[PDB]
Amino acid sequence: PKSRRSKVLTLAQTEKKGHEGKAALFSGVQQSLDSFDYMWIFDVTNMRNTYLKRIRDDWKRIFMGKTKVMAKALGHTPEEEHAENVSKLTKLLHGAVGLLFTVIGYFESFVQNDFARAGAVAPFTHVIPAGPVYSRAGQIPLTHTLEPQVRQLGMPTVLKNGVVTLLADFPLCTEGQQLDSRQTRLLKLFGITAAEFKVGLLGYYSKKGASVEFL
Amino acid sequence: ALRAQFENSNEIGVFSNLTNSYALVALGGSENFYSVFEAELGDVVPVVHTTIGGTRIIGRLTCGNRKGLLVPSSTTDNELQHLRNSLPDPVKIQRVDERLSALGNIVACNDYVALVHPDIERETEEIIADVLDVEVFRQTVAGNVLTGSYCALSNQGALVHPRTSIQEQDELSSLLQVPLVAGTINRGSDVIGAGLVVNDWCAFAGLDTTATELAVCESIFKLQD
Amino acid sequence: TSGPRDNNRNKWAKKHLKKGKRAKNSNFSKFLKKK
Amino acid sequence: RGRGAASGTKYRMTLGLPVQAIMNCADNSGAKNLYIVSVFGTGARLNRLPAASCGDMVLATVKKGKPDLRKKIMPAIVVRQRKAWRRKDGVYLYFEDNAGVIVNPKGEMKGSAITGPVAKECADLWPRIASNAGTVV
Amino acid sequence: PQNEYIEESIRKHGRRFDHEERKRKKAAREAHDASLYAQKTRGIKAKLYQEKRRKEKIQMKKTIKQHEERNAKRMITKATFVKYERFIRPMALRQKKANVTHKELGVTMQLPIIGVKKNPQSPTYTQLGVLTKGTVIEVNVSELGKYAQITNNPELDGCVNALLLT
Amino acid sequence: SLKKKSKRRTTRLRSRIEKKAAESKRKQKR
RNA sequence: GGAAGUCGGCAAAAUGCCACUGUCCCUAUCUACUAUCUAGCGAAACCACAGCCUGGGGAACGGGCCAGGCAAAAUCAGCGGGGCUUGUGGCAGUCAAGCGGCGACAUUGCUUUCCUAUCAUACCGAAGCAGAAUUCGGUAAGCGUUGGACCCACUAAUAGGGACUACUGAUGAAG
RNA sequence: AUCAGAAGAAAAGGUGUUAGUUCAUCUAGACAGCAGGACGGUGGCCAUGGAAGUCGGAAUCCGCUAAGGAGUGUGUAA
């Protein structure tokens, strides 16, 4: 009766609160601004939830929600914001940044490696030798039992007698090249931890000092 | 031994003839059949791509040995002229104006002894001895007059019906001065002459012949050396 | 049975007409043509 | 079972033995008479009684014979023909009597020695009959 | 070949090269194919698709409805049962058993027809035992001698579907 | 025509269409 | 070849289960006569008027009406022609899209030519479809759908159904 | 409209079109499109050769939350 895109439906029963969720995030941001101390601005990075879970463990609460939504709730103008000189803070307040309560040394030093994300530059020039596939670049003393991965690769790989075989040498990634989605997904099947989680501690919105530096 | 078939027929004794001096195969049909014969005897004996009376059944329509070859009166002058041109000098070729035209079905011969369907005419017996230079015995195999089709015979052995009695096998072998075996071919096909073609050094059998018979022919005809 | 009105019978008929099968008709008329 | 194991292919020739015709038994299997009841490989020709020829296969009943071979309709090969038929060579042939042999559907004949002349056509087609033939012209 | 030989072949040689592309595109275009099928087809095949789409539409409506709930001649021309018998009663029209459904129990019970109580059509039909709509018939209810009313037409349906008078 | 039938309804159909429409209206009235 | 034709030894043939036979497969040839043409003789029945076809005209739709297709003298000989309906039962309860108590599907209880709606041949899609063989479905009526008493074989298959003028040849006046 | 148009099947269906009616989010970035995360107790419990959310029976709970359903499908013997 009308040409329109058919919408897929499922039964998750986990629909987000939408406006209520945004209000809850704003309330949490206000409480985090009302927290005791340590005035951190750092929430997430390219790392998975495991790094976030480990970071949350070493604290007695890192959370940002929708970026620039907490800043909007606080208000860019100093009149709306409860803090001082937040007009310049809001400009710096962007991306995955959130308050915490547990620090500086751990964030500066402890940087665990993790699988790379798209857009970055490869730390090296990974090359996949031809023949049987090597999951960990020939570190197995990486079996050839990857029966379903052969159909799921798409790259120059054919199944020979139940063994995945790359007919031609396929360079997985090269240093200085932007990490494509296909390159990142292909590297996911391998042990390429070409990333390092970082943090941002430029300033601290202390209750008394109110000096959030731009370092 | 070899497993080979003409077209898709196992009876290669009908569609071809083979002796110690030459090989006659059917025409116009499968040249793959000519290739099979040429693959084992091409450089040793001539392989004639011939016909008898405009038919492909030349194997059952002729009888011959290393010395002479016979054809029925039904053969044309053109086909007879063809055979003599292709065949070499030491092999003599003759037209046998004889009672039962199918010479292959009535006469099975080697270089020294021949077995004939008793119902042949005396002049035919005389010329066979004159041409083939063999002794002629007007006997029967398994009680059947068609000696040529039921007794595949060569210089080093012979095969007959499994039905024929042991005393009959001993009589035939002693009168032939050669070892004899009562065997089968082509999974119960009792026409041994029509399924197996034999010379003193090579033998061909139908594709449907099982390994047990092929071992038997190998033993009796001693092709291993 | 494939009928002579079949487009693929007609297609392969064409390719026979483009071998030496038709060459023995091209120069074959040239025989008389030089007489 | 029709046209089965008959080696090559048969040229067209005149039709001699229609349905319900009597032929002599040609082999020494033990039979005397055969009765044609049906002919293999006959199309939808309206009001055409199927007919047989040399080298053809027909369902036959042993009209005169020992009771064991009787009572079982089974195929038979017409080995001879009385109607004049012309070879592709051009010569015209015909025999005294219509004769047929008793054969299993596969192609091996049930006899041991056939009697009298054999049609050169059927000897060409049927190697089994050519294996068990006495004289062919 | 033994057991799951194609599964072994898939395992040891892989499936078709473009198989995922073909099935994904087939999974992509049936929405257009369904509308083309619904608009171009005519006749019985159209009508069957008509009724089966309503089946799936109503079904999908109900399963989704369940979802927020989870989130929240002198002869007898009729059937007969067994001078006075002037007409011919065929053995074909003869009826002996009936499907009597109890009112309170609500179970269709196979009960033999003990007899016909009264035929509302005419006394002659009751005398001849002609089964018709609204005719009272008595049947044995030992396994359940009680009356019942025919809720069907035995002439057309061919089965004596009746409801117990209880 | 171009169709599988004739669009001109024969005068029988022009006759009995209206009366059967009238019987339909009477049925709703009843 | 010798009852396969036909409900069938109807009629001939064989003489004055066997055997014979053109009943048939399948007709062909030959003879006489009618037949046609020529010279002569020469009716009657019948006749409102006439004679191309499709659809429609309340009916009876027709040869006249309407809308079309069309339509070129005179003749000779054969042949007689003249908005239904379908593939899916009946009783009872339960929902319940909803409307105004019903309530839709679902659930539970028991008992010659033409048509395509294609059998075969062509192609096609699906199926644990390995090969072969097969099943179901789609396009498709170009082309076939047999021979003998429900049967018994052949066959690729032996699918289901509707129903004076014209026709066929032969001359022919004329721009 | 691949046979459009100039009360009987009829109720229903159409990724055909055009208007309306009633609800939804939306520069606290709407829909879609993309990159990434889509977790850790835990391979929860009976069930079994092998069942790890996805052969199968009840809950189906929790820490981080901005989110990870004792799991939406494909799939793997697992």
UniProtKB/Swiss-Prot annotation, chain A:
Gene3D superfamilies: 3.30.70.1730, 3.90.105.20. It is found in: Nucleus, Nucleolus; Cytoplasm. Its main location: nucleus. One of its GO terms (cellular component) is preribosome, large subunit precursor. GO terms for biological process: assembly of large subunit precursor of preribosome; cytosolic large ribosomal subunit assembly; nuclear-transcribed mRNA catabolic process; ribosomal large subunit biogenesis; rRNA processing. SUPFAM superfamilies: Ribosomal protein L10-like. It comes from the Eukaryota. Disulfide bonds: none annotated. CDD domains: Ribosomal_P0_like. Keywords: Cytoplasm, Nucleus, Ribosome biogenesis. Associates with the pre-60S ribosomal particle. Component of the ribosome assembly machinery. Nuclear paralog of the ribosomal protein P0, it binds pre-60S subunits at an early stage of assembly in the nucleolus, and is replaced by P0 in cytoplasmic pre-60S subunits and mature 80S ribosomes. Belongs to the universal ribosomal protein uL10 family. This is Ribosome assembly factor mrt4.
UniProtKB/Swiss-Prot annotation, chain C:
Residues 11-24 have a biased composition (Basic residues). GO terms for biological process: assembly of large subunit precursor of preribosome. The keyword Nucleus applies. Residues 25-35 have a biased composition (Low complexity). GO terms for cellular component: nucleolus; preribosome. Keywords: Nucleus. The keyword Nucleus applies. Its main location: nucleus. It is found in: Nucleus, Nucleolus. Belongs to the UPF0642 family. This is UPF0642 protein C32H8.05. It comes from Schizosaccharomyces pombe (strain 972 / ATCC 24843) (Fission yeast). The chain holds residues 83 to 117 of 117 of the full protein.
Curated annotation (Swiss-Prot), chain D:
It is found in: Cytoplasm; Nucleus. Keywords: Cytoplasm, Nucleus, Ribonucleoprotein, Ribosomal protein. It comes from the Eukaryota. CDD domains: Ribosomal_uL14. Component of the large ribosomal subunit (LSU). Mature yeast ribosomes consist of a small (40S) and a large (60S) subunit. The 40S small subunit contains 1 molecule of ribosomal RNA (18S rRNA) and at least 33 different proteins. The large 60S subunit contains 3 rRNA molecules (25S, 5.8S and 5S rRNA) and at least 46 different proteins. Component of the ribosome, a large ribonucleoprotein complex responsible for the synthesis of proteins in the cell. The small ribosomal subunit (SSU) binds messenger RNAs (mRNAs) and translates the encoded message by selecting cognate aminoacyl-transfer RNA (tRNA) molecules. The large subunit (LSU) contains the ribosomal catalytic site termed the peptidyl transferase center (PTC), which catalyzes the formation of peptide bonds, thereby polymerizing the amino acids delivered by tRNAs into a polypeptide chain. Belongs to the universal ribosomal protein uL14 family. This is Large ribosomal subunit protein uL14A. The lineage of its organism: Eukaryota, Fungi, Dikarya, Ascomycota, Taphrinomycotina. The gene is rpl2301.
Swiss-Prot record, chain E:
It is found in: Nucleus, Nucleolus. Residues 1-33, 52-72 are annotated as: Disordered. Residues 12-27 have a biased composition (Basic residues). A motif (Nuclear localization signal) lies at residues 10-17. Signal peptide: none annotated. It comes from the Eukaryota. Residues 52-72 have a biased composition (Basic and acidic residues). The keyword RNA-binding does not apply. Its main location: nucleus. Keywords: Nucleus, Phosphoprotein, Ribonucleoprotein, Ribosome biogenesis, rRNA processing. GO terms for biological process: assembly of large subunit precursor of preribosome; maturation of 5.8S rRNA; maturation of LSU-rRNA. GO terms for cellular component: nucleolus; nucleus; preribosome; preribosome, large subunit precursor. Component of the pre-66S ribosomal particle. Interacts with ppp1/nop7 and nop52/rrp1. Interacts with rsa4 (via WD repeats). PANTHER family: RIBOSOME BIOGENESIS PROTEIN NSA2 HOMOLOG (PTHR12642). Involved in the biogenesis of the 60S ribosomal subunit. May play a part in the quality control of pre-60S particles. Belongs to the eukaryotic ribosomal protein eS8 family. Ribosome biogenesis protein NSA2 subfamily. This is Ribosome biogenesis protein nsa2. It comes from Schizosaccharomyces pombe (strain 972 / ATCC 24843). The gene is nsa2.
